[PDB]
Design a protein around this motif. Structure first.
Motif, mmCIF file in Angstrom:
data_model
loop_
_atom_site.group_PDB
_atom_site.id
_atom_site.type_symbol
_atom_site.label_atom_id
_atom_site.label_comp_id
_atom_site.label_asym_id
_atom_site.label_seq_id
_atom_site.Cartn_x
_atom_site.Cartn_y
_atom_site.Cartn_z
ATOM 1 N N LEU A 36 93.594 -4.242 128.402
ATOM 2 C CA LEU A 36 92.487 -4.457 127.424
ATOM 3 C C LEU A 36 93.073 -4.288 126.026
ATOM 4 O O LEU A 36 93.568 -3.143 125.718
ATOM 5 C CB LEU A 36 91.375 -3.427 127.620
ATOM 6 N N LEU A 37 92.965 -5.327 125.189
ATOM 7 C CA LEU A 37 93.733 -5.424 123.917
ATOM 8 C C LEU A 37 92.794 -5.780 122.777
ATOM 9 O O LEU A 37 92.669 -6.940 122.386
ATOM 10 C CB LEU A 37 94.818 -6.476 124.127
ATOM 11 N N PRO A 38 92.058 -4.795 122.233
ATOM 12 C CA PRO A 38 91.261 -5.041 121.033
ATOM 13 C C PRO A 38 92.160 -5.144 119.783
ATOM 14 O O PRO A 38 92.832 -4.173 119.453
ATOM 15 C CB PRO A 38 90.358 -3.824 120.971
ATOM 16 N N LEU A 39 92.179 -6.288 119.116
ATOM 17 C CA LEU A 39 92.994 -6.498 117.874
ATOM 18 C C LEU A 39 92.104 -6.787 116.646
ATOM 19 O O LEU A 39 91.198 -7.664 116.715
ATOM 20 C CB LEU A 39 93.990 -7.646 118.120
ATOM 21 N N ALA A 40 92.382 -6.100 115.528
ATOM 22 C CA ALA A 40 91.699 -6.299 114.222
ATOM 23 C C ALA A 40 92.058 -7.664 113.622
ATOM 24 O O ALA A 40 93.275 -8.049 113.580
ATOM 25 C CB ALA A 40 92.046 -5.194 113.261
ATOM 26 N N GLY A 60 98.957 8.036 111.736
ATOM 27 C CA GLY A 60 98.907 6.588 111.943
ATOM 28 C C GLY A 60 97.517 6.050 111.708
ATOM 29 O O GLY A 60 96.578 6.851 111.718
ATOM 30 N N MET A 61 97.394 4.726 111.554
ATOM 31 C CA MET A 61 96.090 4.034 111.349
ATOM 32 C C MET A 61 95.930 2.987 112.470
ATOM 33 O O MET A 61 96.798 2.112 112.633
ATOM 34 C CB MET A 61 95.947 3.389 109.956
ATOM 35 N N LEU A 62 94.906 3.154 113.296
ATOM 36 C CA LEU A 62 94.682 2.228 114.431
ATOM 37 C C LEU A 62 94.484 0.816 113.856
ATOM 38 O O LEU A 62 93.911 0.683 112.728
ATOM 39 C CB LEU A 62 93.468 2.687 115.254
ATOM 40 N N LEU A 63 94.950 -0.207 114.573
ATOM 41 C CA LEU A 63 94.782 -1.633 114.157
ATOM 42 C C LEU A 63 93.886 -2.411 115.127
ATOM 43 O O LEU A 63 94.204 -3.605 115.365
ATOM 44 C CB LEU A 63 96.142 -2.320 114.036
ATOM 45 N N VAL A 114 86.383 -7.283 108.939
ATOM 46 C CA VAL A 114 87.422 -6.999 109.968
ATOM 47 C C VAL A 114 86.748 -6.925 111.357
ATOM 48 O O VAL A 114 86.138 -5.851 111.739
ATOM 49 C CB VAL A 114 88.257 -5.745 109.621
ATOM 50 N N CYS A 115 86.810 -8.070 112.053
ATOM 51 C CA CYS A 115 86.386 -8.254 113.464
ATOM 52 C C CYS A 115 87.444 -7.642 114.391
ATOM 53 O O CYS A 115 88.549 -7.339 113.943
ATOM 54 C CB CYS A 115 86.129 -9.724 113.799
ATOM 55 N N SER A 116 87.039 -7.417 115.639
ATOM 56 C CA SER A 116 87.864 -7.080 116.813
ATOM 57 C C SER A 116 87.779 -8.269 117.783
ATOM 58 O O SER A 116 86.677 -8.708 118.134
ATOM 59 C CB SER A 116 87.415 -5.790 117.423
ATOM 60 N N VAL A 117 88.915 -8.828 118.166
ATOM 61 C CA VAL A 117 88.945 -9.817 119.280
ATOM 62 C C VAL A 117 89.172 -9.036 120.593
ATOM 63 O O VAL A 117 90.123 -8.214 120.660
ATOM 64 C CB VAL A 117 89.970 -10.943 119.001
ATOM 65 N N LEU A 118 88.252 -9.150 121.562
ATOM 66 C CA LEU A 118 88.303 -8.315 122.800
ATOM 67 C C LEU A 118 89.107 -9.073 123.875
ATOM 68 O O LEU A 118 88.496 -9.747 124.713
ATOM 69 C CB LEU A 118 86.892 -7.954 123.277
ATOM 70 N N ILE A 119 90.436 -8.952 123.859
ATOM 71 C CA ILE A 119 91.355 -9.697 124.774
ATOM 72 C C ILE A 119 91.488 -8.968 126.125
ATOM 73 O O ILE A 119 91.923 -7.788 126.150
ATOM 74 C CB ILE A 119 92.724 -9.926 124.101
ATOM 75 N N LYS A 120 91.200 -9.661 127.230
ATOM 76 C CA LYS A 120 91.545 -9.214 128.610
ATOM 77 C C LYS A 120 92.785 -9.965 129.120
ATOM 78 O O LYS A 120 92.941 -11.212 128.836
ATOM 79 C CB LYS A 120 90.403 -9.386 129.613
ATOM 80 N N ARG A 121 93.629 -9.243 129.863
ATOM 81 C CA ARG A 121 94.870 -9.856 130.431
ATOM 82 C C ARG A 121 94.887 -9.728 131.949
ATOM 83 O O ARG A 121 94.351 -8.781 132.457
ATOM 84 C CB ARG A 121 96.120 -9.260 129.791
ATOM 85 N N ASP A 122 95.523 -10.660 132.646
ATOM 86 C CA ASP A 122 95.583 -10.616 134.142
ATOM 87 C C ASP A 122 96.411 -9.388 134.617
ATOM 88 O O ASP A 122 96.253 -8.945 135.787
ATOM 89 C CB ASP A 122 96.093 -11.953 134.691
ATOM 90 N N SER A 123 97.195 -8.783 133.723
ATOM 91 C CA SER A 123 97.973 -7.540 133.978
ATOM 92 C C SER A 123 97.048 -6.332 134.226
ATOM 93 O O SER A 123 97.509 -5.365 134.822
ATOM 94 C CB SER A 123 98.900 -7.274 132.816
ATOM 95 N N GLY A 124 95.804 -6.355 133.737
ATOM 96 C CA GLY A 124 94.878 -5.198 133.734
ATOM 97 C C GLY A 124 94.718 -4.601 132.330
ATOM 98 O O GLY A 124 93.793 -3.753 132.133
#
Ligand SMILES: Nc1nnc(-c2ccc(O)cc2)s1
Ligand SMILES: Nc1nnc(-c2ccc(O)cc2)s1
Lengths: 171, 172
Positions: A92-96, B119-122, A80-90
């Motif tokens: 920060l969106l780390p997703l599994a 909850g469980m963080l994703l 289970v990796c994290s993709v480190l997404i940056k957005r022009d909105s400001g």
């Protein structure tokens, strides 16, 4: 001292500083007209391409505030990796992302070679904050192993739901 | 998440609170400065306080945030709802952390007794640390989710485990 400091806006997407001299991105986001990057003449930059993966090596330290990280060719199946997404909105969106096999996959009409994965947010990304959008290409795939962060590739593509993704990998 | 939800997230005591309406402010009970006798230029005597464990609601006798509209506050959310926790971090960085919501629970965390919706963080395999997970100063940050046509607030950040993916949302 943060991983997020290393994610940098670049052409039509993003890239990641592995070290003071080493910058990785997705090939298709790189500008096609340029004399320099980050103030350095293109004549002094080594470029190593493998499909949708590009590595730049500079002749002086561009980010001397950083230490060099581990870069590996993808990861084991089921990581289970994290993709480190940056957005022009400001935002920060780390997703599994649960990672699967390396493959040539059909994504929105095109063939893309890299490591497949599936977001844990699942179903449909329903909302821009639970999946990827096209402007996110070049964001890094990372995970923690023992004491070390490992970077294993860059965001290359995603299906229309935004939930099957492809991580372009070195070599 | 929309700019109108981030504008409601206000630095408060040792963490954050959230403007539900021009007159209604919610936060986590342990971030409140225990000595404070005045909030937003109003005396304690002109404010109605509703407290249930780690959930606190302040109701003011005049509009403190007249730029806002009232939005829906509910008592947690259905099991399996995916929420964003709206966390502000050093220098205009906005960290909307994804969380799958579970059961009402009672836990002991860092020795303290906590109650609310688990909850469980994703965000990763484990969220230990500040790049993927929550830190003490995040307490009071709101749990929001979008439905068909609108957004709902369903509690405030109260706690998280040492070295795992588990968080607790204090609820009304
Ligand atoms: N062509 C290259 N492949 N890997 C390189 C690398 C990896 C990790 C580092 O921290 C610095 C450089 S150079
Ligand atoms: N005791 C209370 N519970 N909910 C309240 C509320 C909800 C939505 C609003 O827009 C304003 C107030 S007051």
């Amino acid at each position: 001292p943060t991983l997020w400091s290393r994610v940098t806006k670049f052409g039509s997407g993003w890239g990641f500083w592995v070290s003071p001299t080493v910058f990785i991105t997705t090939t298709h986001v790189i500008p096609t007209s340029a004399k320099e990057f980050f103030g350095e003449p293109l004549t002094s930059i080594a470029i190593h391409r493998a499909g949708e993966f590009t590595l730049f090596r500079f002749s002086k330290k561009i980010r001397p505030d950083l230490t060099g990280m581990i870069l590996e060719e993808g990861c084991p199946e089921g990581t289970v990796c994290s993709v480190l997404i940056k957005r022009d909105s400001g935002e920060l969106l780390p997703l599994a992302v649960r990672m699967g096999a390396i493959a040539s996959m059909r994504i929105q009409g095109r063939l893309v070679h890299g490591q497949s994965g599936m977001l844990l947010t699942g179903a449909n990304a329903k909302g821009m904050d639970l999946g990827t959008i096209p402007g996110d290409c070049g964001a890094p795939y990372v995970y923690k192993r023992a004491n070390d962060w490992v970077v294993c590739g860059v965001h290359a593509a995603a299906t229309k739901s935004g939930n099957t993704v492809v991580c372009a990998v070195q070599a």
